[PDB]
Design an enzyme around this catalytic site. Structure first.
Site, PDB file in Angstrom:
ATOM      1  N   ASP A   1      10.798  16.205  -9.841  1.00  0.00           N
ATOM      2  CA  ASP A   1      11.645  16.536 -11.013  1.00  0.00           C
ATOM      3  C   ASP A   1      12.016  15.264 -11.781  1.00  0.00           C
ATOM      4  O   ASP A   1      13.048  15.285 -12.516  1.00  0.00           O
ATOM      5  CB  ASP A   1      12.900  17.278 -10.538  1.00  0.00           C
ATOM      6  CG  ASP A   1      13.811  16.489  -9.600  1.00  0.00           C
ATOM      7  OD1 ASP A   1      13.460  15.345  -9.241  1.00  0.00           O
ATOM      8  OD2 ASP A   1      14.874  17.034  -9.226  1.00  0.00           O
TER       9      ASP A   1
ATOM     10  N   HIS B   1       1.334   2.247   2.593  1.00  0.00           N
ATOM     11  CA  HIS B   1       1.556   0.835   3.016  1.00  0.00           C
ATOM     12  C   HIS B   1       0.220   0.209   3.431  1.00  0.00           C
ATOM     13  O   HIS B   1       0.094  -1.029   3.419  1.00  0.00           O
ATOM     14  CB  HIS B   1       2.649   0.771   4.095  1.00  0.00           C
ATOM     15  CG  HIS B   1       3.991   1.170   3.578  1.00  0.00           C
ATOM     16  ND1 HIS B   1       5.029   1.576   4.414  1.00  0.00           N
ATOM     17  CD2 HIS B   1       4.457   1.262   2.308  1.00  0.00           C
ATOM     18  CE1 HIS B   1       6.092   1.854   3.678  1.00  0.00           C
ATOM     19  NE2 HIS B   1       5.763   1.678   2.378  1.00  0.00           N
TER      20      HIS B   1
ATOM     21  N   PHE C   1      12.768  18.223  -4.979  1.00  0.00           N
ATOM     22  CA  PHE C   1      11.892  18.704  -6.076  1.00  0.00           C
ATOM     23  C   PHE C   1      11.223  17.493  -6.716  1.00  0.00           C
ATOM     24  O   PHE C   1      11.831  16.407  -6.671  1.00  0.00           O
ATOM     25  CB  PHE C   1      12.707  19.521  -7.084  1.00  0.00           C
ATOM     26  CG  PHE C   1      13.452  20.642  -6.411  1.00  0.00           C
ATOM     27  CD1 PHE C   1      12.758  21.699  -5.844  1.00  0.00           C
ATOM     28  CD2 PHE C   1      14.820  20.577  -6.238  1.00  0.00           C
ATOM     29  CE1 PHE C   1      13.435  22.702  -5.172  1.00  0.00           C
ATOM     30  CE2 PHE C   1      15.490  21.578  -5.554  1.00  0.00           C
ATOM     31  CZ  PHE C   1      14.799  22.637  -5.025  1.00  0.00           C
TER      32      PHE C   1
ATOM     33  N   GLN D   1       3.756   5.671  -4.477  1.00  0.00           N
ATOM     34  CA  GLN D   1       5.135   5.150  -4.313  1.00  0.00           C
ATOM     35  C   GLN D   1       6.076   5.868  -5.298  1.00  0.00           C
ATOM     36  O   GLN D   1       7.233   6.148  -4.919  1.00  0.00           O
ATOM     37  CB  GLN D   1       5.162   3.631  -4.477  1.00  0.00           C
ATOM     38  CG  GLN D   1       6.448   3.022  -3.967  1.00  0.00           C
ATOM     39  CD  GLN D   1       6.492   1.535  -4.170  1.00  0.00           C
ATOM     40  OE1 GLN D   1       5.895   1.013  -5.102  1.00  0.00           O
ATOM     41  NE2 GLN D   1       7.234   0.852  -3.312  1.00  0.00           N
TER      42      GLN D   1
HETATM   43  C1  HEM Z   1       4.222  -3.259  -2.598  1.00  0.00           C
HETATM   44  C2  HEM Z   1       4.333  -1.961  -2.312  1.00  0.00           C
HETATM   45  C3  HEM Z   1       5.356  -1.342  -1.453  1.00  0.00           C
HETATM   46  C4  HEM Z   1       6.460  -1.918  -0.903  1.00  0.00           C
HETATM   47  C5  HEM Z   1       6.869  -3.368  -1.120  1.00  0.00           C
HETATM   48  C6  HEM Z   1       7.108  -0.917  -0.125  1.00  0.00           C
HETATM   49  C7  HEM Z   1       8.283  -1.177   0.586  1.00  0.00           C
HETATM   50  C8  HEM Z   1       8.976  -0.212   1.297  1.00  0.00           C
HETATM   51  C9  HEM Z   1      10.198  -0.410   2.011  1.00  0.00           C
HETATM   52  C10 HEM Z   1      11.001  -1.686   2.185  1.00  0.00           C
HETATM   53  C11 HEM Z   1      10.546   0.782   2.563  1.00  0.00           C
HETATM   54  C12 HEM Z   1      11.772   1.075   3.429  1.00  0.00           C
HETATM   55  C13 HEM Z   1      11.423   0.906   4.927  1.00  0.00           C
HETATM   56  C14 HEM Z   1      12.579   1.280   5.874  1.00  0.00           C
HETATM   57  O1  HEM Z   1      13.669   0.646   5.895  1.00  0.00           O
HETATM   58  O2  HEM Z   1      12.476   2.229   6.690  1.00  0.00           O
HETATM   59  C15 HEM Z   1       9.540   1.715   2.206  1.00  0.00           C
HETATM   60  C16 HEM Z   1       9.612   3.028   2.536  1.00  0.00           C
HETATM   61  C17 HEM Z   1       8.656   3.910   2.113  1.00  0.00           C
HETATM   62  N1  HEM Z   1       7.530   3.680   1.406  1.00  0.00           N
HETATM   63 FE1  HEM Z   1       6.939   2.028   0.801  1.00  0.00          FE
HETATM   64  N2  HEM Z   1       6.406   0.233  -0.166  1.00  0.00           N
HETATM   65  C18 HEM Z   1       5.329   0.058  -0.956  1.00  0.00           C
HETATM   66  C19 HEM Z   1       4.321   0.956  -1.292  1.00  0.00           C
HETATM   67  C20 HEM Z   1       4.342   2.308  -0.925  1.00  0.00           C
HETATM   68  C21 HEM Z   1       3.387   3.280  -1.260  1.00  0.00           C
HETATM   69  C22 HEM Z   1       2.165   2.994  -2.062  1.00  0.00           C
HETATM   70  C23 HEM Z   1       3.788   4.489  -0.714  1.00  0.00           C
HETATM   71  C24 HEM Z   1       3.146   5.813  -0.745  1.00  0.00           C
HETATM   72  C25 HEM Z   1       1.956   6.044  -1.287  1.00  0.00           C
HETATM   73  C26 HEM Z   1       5.013   4.223  -0.059  1.00  0.00           C
HETATM   74  C27 HEM Z   1       5.735   5.146   0.594  1.00  0.00           C
HETATM   75  C28 HEM Z   1       6.923   4.861   1.238  1.00  0.00           C
HETATM   76  C29 HEM Z   1       7.734   5.914   1.838  1.00  0.00           C
HETATM   77  C30 HEM Z   1       7.461   7.390   1.928  1.00  0.00           C
HETATM   78  C31 HEM Z   1       8.794   5.334   2.380  1.00  0.00           C
HETATM   79  C32 HEM Z   1       9.929   6.016   3.058  1.00  0.00           C
HETATM   80  C33 HEM Z   1      10.886   6.423   1.924  1.00  0.00           C
HETATM   81  C34 HEM Z   1      11.105   5.346   0.868  1.00  0.00           C
HETATM   82  O3  HEM Z   1      10.200   5.061   0.025  1.00  0.00           O
HETATM   83  O4  HEM Z   1      12.186   4.696   0.770  1.00  0.00           O
HETATM   84  N3  HEM Z   1       5.320   2.903  -0.164  1.00  0.00           N
HETATM   85  N4  HEM Z   1       8.589   1.104   1.421  1.00  0.00           N
HETATM   86 CA   LIG Z   2      13.134  14.509  -6.872  1.00  0.00          CA
HETATM   87  K   LIG Z   3       9.883   2.959  -1.069  1.00  0.00           K
END
Ligand code: HEM
Ligand SMILES: [Ca+2]
Ligand SMILES: [K+]
Ligand SMILES: *[C@@H]1O[C@H](CO)[C@@H](O[C@@H]2O[C@H](CO)[C@@H](O)[C@H](O)[C@H]2NC(C)=O)[C@H](O)[C@H]1NC(C)=O
Ligand SMILES: *[C@@H]1O[C@H](CO)[C@@H](O[C@@H]2O[C@H](CO)[C@@H](O)[C@H](O)[C@H]2NC(C)=O)[C@H](O)[C@H]1NC(C)=O
Ligand SMILES: *[C@@H]1O[C@H](CO)[C@@H](O)[C@H](O)[C@H]1NC(C)=O
Ligand SMILES: *[C@@H]1O[C@H](CO)[C@@H](O)[C@H](O)[C@H]1NC(C)=O
Ligand SMILES: [K+]
Ligand SMILES: [Zn+2]
EC number: 1.11.1.7
Length: 595
Positions: A188, A351, A186, A105
């Site tokens: 960064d 997720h 990046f 994350q």
């Molecule tokens: C309790 C843990 C986590 C929560 C509550 C969480 C929650 C969220 C939420 C609300 C979004 C936005 C969804 C949207 O509107 O499209 C999101 C996006 C995303 N999450 Fe998670 N996430 C968690 C853990 C992780 C982990 C562990 C990863 C990767 C290893 C991850 C990668 C991503 C990615 C790539 C996105 C799209 C870009 C962004 O982070 O905003 N997430 N997540």
């Molecule tokens: Ca960056």
């Molecule tokens: K996120």
């Protein structure tokens, strides 16, 4: 030629070009193309955008229009039928700590952010979306299918607003809609420092010439710093406990307080920046605040690069690591450093690595008081459990001693995220991340599973039997076909995560190819990559080789016992060594003597 150029603020600057430091925005990294990888620009397209109408309308908008002559299943339908499971027993990853999930994350948030369209600032557009579930403009609600328990309890739909595109109006010289990356492509440490100059300055301590980041003045963690509070109102973090009234943290990244373990990691990194700045002030008392800030910022950046490429990617990519990320051959300014739209969905494999509970542990790594283990959903936008309930040391111990969830074809996403997600805009632990992920795929004009299979050189299953063979799983293939009718229409997020993991890795072949290529590009196309000759001295690189997450914890907490390899599953005490055994970052090579 209409240029729907609006998205967000692009600061604009002349490039220094001979600065040894990154810009905040990511501008000036590529000299030929200074905007390449900078924040507030379109995500790169590896394949052309696929929209119901070829422009902007996501597949599933017009209940009538098909995808290849099939209706696309409701996002919540797919979630209910495939992504849900009841039994958390046996679901934990036996060889990945919770730190494996959490680092993912952190890396993700450094790389990409596709913020929802605002316009709903003190708005009735918000009401027409939430209260009335009315599709139109940026409201693309997630409708509940028939027999959905949330129909009985929450209403007809979850509200959902479309990602910010080259910004709020849809008329051009006729081009497909391109979603914005609000953060630098990046690796960064932008999630610490900001991707926007104004915020980056506000985060800093400019009251002293010591290059520090600003720390909370209202609260301390037994002498150790907290992030400042965000005092913007209304506060989602205040809302989840109006008694405690502890607001969200202010960080380089808007999402820092989304859940307590991410808040925790952001705290660790800020602490490390100040520690770095104080050490460099001792070594070089003549260095001014700007120099201190940039040089600590520069070390912290390479620290994130080193943990990610040495410790993290190999245990994600497994057998496929060397295929996609061979040994570094130096900076290649022809490589596109920009994060791809599809990567923003590929990396959401995380997720399926989030477990249903979080534990606070004491100094013998035993349960910390009577409410040690908490349901994940109570910890979304929760800062009061840090400030008012033991600080971060108990949660860090949990990160070391507890396990990530294993992705399982029968147990994909915990109900804590699949039914009880809290959104910062809304009032309920009632949202579905998996349904949001699938809705967002369509919002972003994602090509389908087989388009990406093809992109990655993999067989494209066209029949039940074909999908059963790719997935090594007959019931999952069948449920998938009954919903999607052709593997061509399977949304990329469920498609990629459905596939069994590669040898020694935590993703399937398609995700490995997608993540592999993106991580190859963020290394090779980065002029400030820590191994690029001239970025560090050979000796500074020798110091940097010795960094570990274990040391970061030793140096920025009151935890004295840590594992050597913080990402594998580790039990206390057999797998834990005293901090005095752990390699330190030797900063002697940053000494600057004019004589
Ligand atoms: C309790 C843990 C986590 C929560 C509550 C969480 C929650 C969220 C939420 C609300 C979004 C936005 C969804 C949207 O509107 O499209 C999101 C996006 C995303 N999450 Fe998670 N996430 C968690 C853990 C992780 C982990 C562990 C990863 C990767 C290893 C991850 C990668 C991503 C990615 C790539 C996105 C799209 C870009 C962004 O982070 O905003 N997430 N997540
Ligand atoms: Ca960056
Ligand atoms: K996120
Ligand atoms: C900016 O840096 C200054 C100086 O290092 C901080 O002030 C010190 O803070 C500690 C802890 O509050 C005190 O023990 C010192 O006595 C303070 N020194 C001075 C000169 O007041 C200051 O709090 C930092 N500001 C922020 C917002 O983080
Ligand atoms: C730097 O990256 C570029 C772009 O990926 C590479 O360019 C390719 O070089 C080979 C060599 O003959 C050509 O066949 C390709 O068509 C080139 N362009 C592409 C694929 O975009 C190049 O390999 C890299 N250069 C160095 C010095 O490593
Ligand atoms: C766990 O994973 C690491 C690599 O990440 C590996 O070296 C080690 O053998 C594994 N330990 C097990 C399977 O318990
Ligand atoms: C809110 O925080 C207080 C301490 O501030 C605690 O006693 C109470 O249980 C918390 N309430 C909720 C709803 O979490
Ligand atoms: K793409
Ligand atoms: Zn203490």
């Amino acid at each position: 030629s209409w240029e729907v150029g609006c998205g967000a603020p692009v600061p604009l600057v002349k490039c220094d070009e001979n600065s040894p430091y990154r810009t905040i925005t990511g501008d000036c990294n590529n000299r030929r193309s200074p905007a390449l990888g900078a924040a507030n620009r379109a995500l790169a397209r590896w394949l052309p955008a696929e929209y119901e109408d070829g422009l902007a309308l996501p597949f599933g908008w017009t209940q009538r229009k098909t995808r290849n002559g099939f209706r696309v299943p409701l996002a919540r339908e797919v979630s209910n039928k495939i992504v849900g499971y009841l039994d958390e027993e046996g679901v934990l990853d036996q060889n990945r700590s919770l730190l494996f999930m959490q680092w993912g994350q952190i890396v993700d948030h450094d790389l990409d952010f596709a913020p929802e369209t605002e316009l709903g600032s003190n708005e009735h557009s918000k009401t027409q979306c939430e209260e009335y579930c009315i599709q139109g403009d940026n409201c693309f609600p997630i409708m509940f299918p028939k027999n959905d328990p949330k129909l009985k309890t929450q209403g007809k739909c979850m509200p959902f607003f479309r990602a910010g595109f080259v910004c709020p109006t849809p008329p051009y010289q006729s081009l497909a809609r391109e979603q914005i990356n609000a953060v630098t492509s990046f690796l960064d440490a932008s999630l610490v420092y900001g991707s926007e100059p104004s915020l980056a300055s506000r985060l800093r301590n400019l009251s002293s010439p010591l290059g520090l980041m600003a720390v909370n003045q209202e609260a301390w963690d037994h002498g150790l710093a907290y992030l400042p509070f965000n005092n913007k109102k209304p506060s989602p973090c205040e809302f989840i406990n109006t008694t405690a009234r502890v607001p969200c943290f202010l960080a380089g990244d808007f999402r820092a307080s989304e859940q307590i373990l991410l808040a925790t990691a952001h705290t660790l990194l800020l602490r490390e920046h100040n520690r770095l700045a104080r050490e460099l002030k001792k070594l070089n008392p003549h260095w001014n605040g700007e120099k201190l800030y940039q040089e600590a910022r520069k070390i912290l950046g390479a620290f994130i690069q080193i943990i990610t490429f040495r410790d993290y990617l190999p245990i994600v990519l497994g057998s496929e690591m060397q295929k996609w990320i061979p040994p570094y051959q130096g900076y290649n300014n022809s490589v596109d450093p920009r994060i791809s739209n599809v990567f923003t969905f590929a990396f959401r494999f995380g997720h399926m690595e989030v477990p249903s509970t979080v534990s606070r542990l004491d100094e013998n790594y035993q349960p910390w008081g009577p409410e040690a283990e908490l349901p994940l959903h109570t910890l979304f936008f929760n800062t009061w459990r840090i400030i008012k309930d033991g600080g971060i040391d108990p949660l860090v111990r949990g990160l070391l001693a507890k396990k990530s969830k294993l992705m399982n074809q029968d147990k994909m996403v915990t109900s804590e995220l699949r039914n009880k997600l809290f959104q910062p805009t809304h009032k309920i632990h009632g949202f579905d991340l998996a349904a949001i992920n699938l809705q967002r795929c369509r919002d972003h004009g994602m090509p389908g599973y087989n388009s990406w299979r093809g992109f990655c050189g993999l067989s494209q299953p066209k029949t039940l039997k074909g999908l059963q063979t790719v997935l090594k799983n007959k019931i999952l293939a069948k449920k998938l076909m009954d919903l999607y009718k052709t593997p061509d229409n399977i949304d990329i997020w469920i498609g990629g995560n459905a596939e069994p993991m590669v040898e020694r890795g935590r993703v399937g072949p398609l995700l490995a190819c997608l993540l592999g290529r993106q991580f190859q590009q963020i290394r090779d196309g980065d002029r400030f990559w820590w191994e690029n000759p001239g970025v560090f001295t050979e000796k500074q690189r020798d110091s940097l080789q010795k960094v570990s997450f274990s040391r970061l914890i030793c140096d920025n907490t009151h935890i004295t016992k840590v594992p050597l390899h913080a990402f594998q599953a580790n039990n206390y005490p057999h797998d834990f060594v005293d901090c005095s055994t752990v390699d330190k970052l030797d900063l002697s090579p940053w000494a600057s003597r004019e004589n």
